[PDB]
Amino acid sequence: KQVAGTMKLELAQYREVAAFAQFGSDLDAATQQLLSRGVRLTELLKQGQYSPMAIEEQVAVIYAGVRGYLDKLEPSKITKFENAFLSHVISQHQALLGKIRTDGKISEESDAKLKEIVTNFLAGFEA
Amino acid sequence: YFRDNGKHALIIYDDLSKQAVAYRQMSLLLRRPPGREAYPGDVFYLHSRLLERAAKMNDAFGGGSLTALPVIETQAGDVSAYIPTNVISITDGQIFLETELFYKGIRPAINVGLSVSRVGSAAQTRAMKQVAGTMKLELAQYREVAAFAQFGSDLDAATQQLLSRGVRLTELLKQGQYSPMAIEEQVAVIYAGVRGYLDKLEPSKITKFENAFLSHVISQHQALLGKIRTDGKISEESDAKLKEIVTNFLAGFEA
Amino acid sequence: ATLKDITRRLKSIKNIQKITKSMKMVAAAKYARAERELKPARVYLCGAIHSSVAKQMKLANIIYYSLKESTTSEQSARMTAMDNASKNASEMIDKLTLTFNRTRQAVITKELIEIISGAAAL
Amino acid sequence: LTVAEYFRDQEGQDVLLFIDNIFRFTQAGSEVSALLGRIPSAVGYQPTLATDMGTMQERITTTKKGSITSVQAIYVPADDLTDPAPATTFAHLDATTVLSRAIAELGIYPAVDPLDSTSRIMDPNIVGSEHYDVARGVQKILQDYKSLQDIIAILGMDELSEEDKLTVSRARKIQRFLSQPFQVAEVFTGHLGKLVPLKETIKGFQQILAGEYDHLPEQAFYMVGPIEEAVAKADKLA
Amino acid sequence: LTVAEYFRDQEGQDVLLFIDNIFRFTQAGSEVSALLGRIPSAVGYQPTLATDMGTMQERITTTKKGSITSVQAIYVPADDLTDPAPATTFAHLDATTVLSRAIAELGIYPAVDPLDSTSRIMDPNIVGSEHYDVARGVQKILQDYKSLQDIIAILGMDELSEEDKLTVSRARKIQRFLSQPFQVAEVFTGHLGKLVPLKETIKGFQQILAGEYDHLPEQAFYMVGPIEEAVAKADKLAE
């Protein structure tokens, strides 16, 4: 619920300006940003067949986009990022994913932890 | 009865659209073959035989008459639907009431461009021809100088006057419910706009002008109205007379 | 009319509607700035702009002057153009939707009649 | 309808009949008709579509005893209003209440779209001249503001003339004054529900249009009952 | 079918079953349907359309006894793919090659619609990841172009970004690179019949996606064989 709501809202705004994207000859940073968040979240909604992920894993990848740690990354690379990121946390961060479940939501601690992971991972992704 | 008794009657069918559906219910239950819109292939004759009765008998046959005013409910303004066109191919004219005009405040919302009266002009009072006759001409010009693009910077004194007259005349044709007007009063208020006594007045004040000038001529001009009513034709005397009447009012119309 | 065809035209005109509406605001945003720059300037599909001056065409002070007037007039005509263009598009859409719904109902009624008749002949 | 009829024809009350929804009422009809072997009319609706609907709707009327007002939920198939089902239903409607999600998102509860919701009795010879003109003013001010919605984030909310800036504020105040706390929300939002009488409803917006409150914060006219409460709230907002 | 069934079972040999046109099975049935006293179903087709098709189609299958690679030509009434006949046939296939008249009119032959044809083996763990990526990439760019088409339909063109003008050009080249001169249609193509091996197919399109051949005219791919023929043709099209 926590991350579902924000994503939904952002996606709505995106659709409201979606058409203006392909004709972005001159747009204000605000509308552009809406398109940025939009396309990224759209990429995050992609999922391979025969590979249903756990709710903790879902909220984890949603966190990346919703919080904007993908607004700069090119849409084409977002699909790659999701894979590398998710697989990374599921490995050396099972505790975090587990804590999310235990707390039943994204606790402030886990929120700060994920923040350090996504930021450090981002740089490692674009280097 | 009245018709064949030298009297005149008026019958309003409100509405023939619902009758058609009722007849359709019957036909389909009767298992009669469903045609266009599943309507039985005789809905035309259903309305033809009915409306055909409305007629004007000559003196030899009493001189009676039965005027019919059937009502038809369209969908999305499609005046090309089976039922509508069928009734249109039976009556001697229609009065198209556009939804847009209704919401637009134009009441009655009579689309002066689609509404027609094939055999009725010859029954129009002479007084009307003397004012309404030139009115529709002006309304024709106004209608011509129009477009959906409301945001259009148009000029040219000629076309400008056509627009000026048009909007004023439109405001003059606006009328409320339950308040019918005598023919003499109609030609009077119409005379104002046609002759242009409303050209030098704000479009909004036009309506107010009617709801002021009318009572003005009804009260202090029963004689003039009575003349036009009896003669049924505005004589030059009554014309010049009315010219002064309106002018005097214009010189004192408070806004 | 064919529902398949109507649907196609509906989608295209709907695209044009959005596009036009977009360009309108874009040009309008430029026009906003231009109108303001019009003051300092005079201190020294884009409607009928090109054709108009074309059927007439064939220092720095004047050049800058005209140049500043060019952008303004261009955004003005464009704004008004797209403004009415999207409006026309919208009307065209509603008209197609009505014709669509008519064809839609007709279709159902036709098939159904064919079914009833076919059955009532055994 | 029969359960409601009792109260009217016996206790002479003003009963409220809810039918959710009316479309499924018609559908059930076409189905029954089909099973009986009746030939389907346009779009497959039963031939007795006119009667089936009529007979039922005709029982919902005002008598010299009581009355029965029916709030029927409507489902417009294929979003086609010319389709027989909705076309027939509209022939028996007197008013409409369009619950728009967009309005709900703006926080305006109830989410009643003040431009779609219409009523036939909203005529001066019925609801009165004052009520008519006040209602009209509200609808108009909102429409005008809507027209400006575009110019706002285009040319800049400042280029608008005094009157335009006044219509904006007033329209927003009215728009907010349209929200009203429901008693049903008491056991949830923890807010006392209000029952604003028609008189205070008219007077309230009437004053807003007059601009008598052009000096109070817009939030003051949010989720309040009588205009007086909005004034007090304004004082609380300081 | 019975003929193929024998070779399949009592022989255990690979049998090829080519049927043209299978739709005629359904049509024949609708004709006698009325005379058999049946009530007309949707679009006037017999009420036993699905079952009749099922009892037959289900026999046309590969068993543990023998394999039958069946290729059936399915007619589409008035091109309406929603017609009860072809619509019901779709669920009895593993590979669908939908032919579009629009593409045929353009001149791209075969008139295969790249955005309406699918295969069950188009899984990255069957045809390979590389193949899957190329196929999807081609389908995407084509779809993107399709979406850009109605966008500029009557709205100029000089507004699209470098990316858009790039996708359009590429997509069109790919579109025209899909046409392959068939030996059978030599008297219709006025060209020699060419056959392109899967490897070269993936290679060529993969390279076009990479934009390597963005320095060749669209017509250089229109009705050719391997990408080599396109490049060679390009240089040949000096004037």
Write out the DSSP string of D201-220. Answer: HHHHHHHHHHTTTTTS-GGG
CA A92 – CA A86 distance, rounded (Å): 11
Asked whether the beta carbons of residue A26 and residue C29 sit closer than 8 angstroms, the reply is yes
Q: What is the CATH number of domain D122-237?
A: 1.10.1140.10
Q: Both tokens of residue C48?
A: 């009928």
CA A5-A8-A11 angle, to 5 degrees, is 150
Find tokens 């009447």 and name the residue. Answer: B245
Tokens found for residue B157: 């004194």
Q: Do D42 and C105 touch (CB under 8 A)?
A: yes
Q: Which residue, C33, C34, C15, is CA-closest to C23?
A: C15
CA distance C59 to chain B (A): 33
Residues of D with Cβ-Cβ distance to C112 under 8 angstroms: 40, 44
Q: What is the spatial distance between Cα B16 and Cα B23, in angstroms, rounded to a whole number?
A: 10
CB contact under 8 A, A23 and E159: yes
Contacts of B34 in chain D (CB under 8 A): 39, 41
Q: Which two tokens stand for residue A114?
A: 């994920």
Q: Residue B205 maps to which CATH number?
A: 1.20.150.20
DSSP bridge partners of D14: D67
| CA–CA gap between residue D118 and residue D137 (Å, rounded) | 14
Nearest-by-CA chain E residue for C8:
E150
Distance from the D218 Cα atom to the nearest Cα atom in chain C, whole angstroms: 28
Domain encompassing residue B181: 125-255
Residue E72 phi, psi (nearest 5): -115, 135
Instruction: Classify burial at E239, counting beta carbons within 10 Å of its beta carbon; exposed 0-12, middle 13-18, buried 19 or more.
Output: exposed
Between chain A and chain E, the number of residue pairs with CB atoms below 8 A apart is 8
Long-range residue pairs from E154-159, CB within 8 A, at least 24 positions apart, any chain: E154/C16, E155/C16, E155/C19, E155/C20, E155/C45, E156/C45, E159/A23, E159/A25
**CB-CB: which of D47, D81, D87 is closest to B25?**
D47
- Sign of torsion, CA B163 B169 B170 B171? positive
DSSP notation for chain B: --GGGT-EEEEEETTHHHHHHHHHHHHHHTT--B-GGG-BTTHHHHHHHHHHH--B--GGGTT-EEEEEE----STT-TTSHHHHHHHTTSSEE--B-HHHHHTT-SS-B-TTT-EETT-GGGS-HHHHTTHHHHHHHHHHHHHS--S--------HHHHHHHHHHHHHHHHH---TT----HHHHHHHHHHHHHTTTTTS-HHHHHHHHHHHHHHHHHTTHHHHHHHHHHSS--HHHHHHHHHHHHHHHTT---
Closest Cα in chain E, distance from residue A24 (Å): 9
Q: Look up residue D67 and give its DSSP letter.
A: E
Q: Which helix (H) or strand (E) holds D40?
A: none
CATH number of E122-239: 1.10.1140.10
- The identity of residue B165, as a single letter, is R
Task: Give the whole-angstrom CA distance, residue E80 versus residue E46.
Answer: 18
The domain tally of chain A equals 1
* End-to-end Cα spacing for chain E: 53
**Angle of helix A75-92 relative to helix A108-125, nearest 10 degrees?**
120
Contacts of B94 (CB under 8 A, 6+ apart): B72, B88, B114, B115, B116
Query: CA of C83, closest CA in chain E: separation in Å?
Result: 14
Hey, are the CB atoms on B28 and D42 less than 8 Å from each other?
Answer: no
Q: Are strands B116-117 and B93-94 parallel, antiparallel or unpaired?
A: antiparallel
For testing contact with chain E, the best of A20, A22, A42 (most E CBs within 10 A): A22
The per-residue DSSP string of chain E comes to -HHHHHHHTTT---EEEEEE-THHHHHHHHHHHHHTTPPP-GGG--TTHHHHHHHHHTTSS--SS--EEEEEE---GGG-TTSHHHHHHGGG-SEE--B-HHHHHHT-SS-B-TTS-EETT-STTTT-HHHHHHHHHHHHHHHHHHHHHHHHTTS-STTS-HHHHHHHHHHHHHHHHH----STTHHHHTS------HHHHHHHHHHHHTTTTTTS-GGGTTT-SSHHHHHHHHHHTT-
- Neighbouring chains of A at 3+ CB pairs under 8 Å are C, E
Residue A49 annotated as binding site? yes
Encoded tokens for A107:
């606790």
Assign D140 to helix, strand or coil.
helix
What CA–CA distance (Å, rounded) separates B194 from D73? 50
Q: At what angle do helices B236-250 and B222-231 cross, to 10 degrees?
A: 150
Q: Which two tokens stand for residue D85?
A: 């089902």
Residue in chain E lying closest to A25 (CA):
E159
What is d(CA B254, CA B208) in angstroms, rounded to the nearest whole number? 10
Containing D39, the helix (H) or strand (E) segment is: none
The Cβ-side half-sphere exposure at D66, using a 13 Å CA radius, reads 17
Q: Would you say B195 and B239 are in contact if contact means Cβ atoms under 8 Å apart?
A: no
Contact flag C18-A27 (C-beta cutoff 8 Å): no
Structure tokens at E70: 């069946």
Report the residue of A20, A23, A49 to disrupt the E interface, i.e. the one with the largest count of E CBs within 10 Å. A23
Task: Return the sign of the alpha-carbon dihedral for residues D73, D78, D81, D87.
Answer: negative
Secondary structure percentages of chain A, helix, strand, coil, to 5:
75, 0, 25
For residue E88, give the amino acid letter: T
Cα end-to-end span (Å), chain A: 34
Please count the other Cβ atoms lying within 10 Å of the Cβ belonging to residue B176.
11
Q: In this structure, which long-range contacts are made by residues E19-23, counting pairs with CB atoms below 8 Å and at least 24 apart in sequence?
A: E19/E70, E19/E71, E19/E72, E19/E73, E20/E72, E20/E73, E21/E73, E21/E74, E21/E75, E22/E72, E22/E73, E22/E74, E22/E89, E23/E73, E23/E74, E23/E75, E23/E76, E23/E77, E23/E85, E23/E86, E23/E89
Residue of D nearest to B36 (CA): D42
Mapping DSSP onto H, E and C, the string for E139-163 reads: HHHHHHHHHHHHHHCCCCCCCCCHH
Two tokens, residue A82: 């999701």
Residues of chain D numbered 155-194 and touching chain B (CB < 8 Å):
none
C40 lies within 8 A of chain E by CB: no
Contact B34 C113 (CB under 8 A): yes
Q: Is D139 exposed, middle or buried (0-12, 13-18, 19+ CB in 10 A)?
A: middle
Name the residues of B annotated as catalytic.
Answer: 118
The total number of residues written for chain E in this structure: 239
Contact E40 C118 (CB under 8 A): yes
